[PDB]
Each structure stands twice: as C-alpha cells, then as structure tokens.
C-alpha cells in the first residue's frame, strides 16, 4: 500500500514557532522539496524522511503531525480508484480519484469536499488496474489513530 507521486495532500508547515503556511501540493513535490530542506534515511529499500513541524489533513478535517514520509519502488500494480459524491445544491455530482498499490466497488469511504470544507460519504465508483510501474510510490505516516490521510480528497491508509 502506497500512493502515486501525483497524489494531492493538504499540508501545513510552521517556522519559528509562530508562523504557518498551508497549501495543497503533490506528494512527489512534497518529498522532493522536503527531501532537500530536511534529510533522508535509507533502509532495505525505503528512503525515509523525518520532517518536524509539518502536518497533514486527516480524518476529522483536522491537521495532525506528519511524523515520517517515504518513497520506494514497488513491483505491485497501480490501481486507479474513482470515488463519487454528490451534494444537494439541483443535485451537484462530484468524483475524485487516487491511484494506489496493492476493497470493492460499492463500498463507502470518507471524502473531503474542498469547496465546502467538510467531510462527506463517498461511493467506490470504479476500480482499475493500471499495471506495474518504474516510478517511485510514496507513503505517509500520521500521528492520529485513524492511520489515514486525505489523498486527492479521498481518505486512504
């Protein structure tokens, strides 16, 4: 289980104790930027990074500390997951998608509605095997007990 490098996550960073910035950035960019600002560990096949003062949006529409982050090559297939949601505005239908490594069509998952800054229930609308990949895939470790974060608005472990 990892996510693709173009996965979007909501990140907050703090400097000098008192200043903070928040933005939506792709996970490969987060890794590449943060890999230079802070520095890399190495294990059997992980390059593992330990930032401080960075946070990520998780279950509960709250930011918790991002404790570590890593990237690695995997032999596993990338899978594109499309998740539909809708709201009563007269129905506005929305969908989001994330590609993961390794859940059933029809299952419900939590979804972040960015425009209304609230969490909604989504439906697994499709699942697609995109095949193997040579690119790095990425992993994030979160301090809250949900062990989950929002990945292109979809809650993933």
DSSP sequence for 85-136: EEEE--EEEEEEEEEEE---TT-EEEEEETTTTEEEEEEEEEEEEEE--SS-
Q: Are 147 and 61 in contact (CB under 8 A)?
A: no
Contact call for residues 149 and 110 (beta carbons, < 8 A): no
Quote the CA–CA distance of 49 and 119 in Å, as a whole number: 29
| Measured distance CA(9)–CA(94) in Å, rounded | 18
Stated resolution in angstroms: 2.6
Q: Are 5 and 72 in contact (CB under 8 A)?
A: no
Helix (H) or strand (E) holding 32: helix 27-37
Tally of domains within the chain = 2
Same domain, 84 and 66: no
Residues 66 and 101 in one domain: no
Do 122 and 139 fall within a single domain? Answer: no
For residue 83, what are the domain limits?
78-131
**Residue entry with tokens 């069509």:** 105
Phi/psi of residue 67, nearest 5 degrees: -85, -45
Q: Which residues contact 91 (CB under 8 A, 6 or more apart)?
A: none
Residue 122 lies in a domain: yes
120: β partners: 111
Which experiment gave this structure?
X-ray
Question: Residue 71 — φ and ψ, nearest 5°?
Answer: -140, 155
Residue 108 lies in a domain: yes
């Amino acid at each position: 289980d990892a996510v693709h490098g173009k996965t979007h996550v909501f990140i907050r960073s703090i400097k000098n104790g008192s200043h903070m910035q928040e933005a939506k950035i792709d996970i490969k960019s987060l890794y590449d930027s943060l890999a230079k600002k802070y520095d890399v560990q190495h294990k059997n096949s992980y390059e593992v990074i330990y930032p401080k003062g960075y946070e990520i949006k998780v279950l509960g529409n709250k930011y918790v500390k991002l404790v570590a982050m890593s990237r690695h090559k995997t032999q596993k297939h990338l899978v594109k997951i499309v998740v539909k949601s809708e709201k009563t505005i007269s129905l506005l239908k929305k969908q989001d998608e994330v590609v993961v490594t390794t859940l059933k069509v029809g299952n419900y998952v939590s979804v972040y509605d960015e425009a209304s800054d609230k969490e909604v229930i989504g439906e697994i609308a499709s699942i697609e095997d995109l095949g193997m990949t040579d690119d790095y895939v990425y992993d994030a470790e979160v301090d809250d007990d949900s062990h989950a974060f929002y990945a292109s608005n979809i809650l993933v472990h």
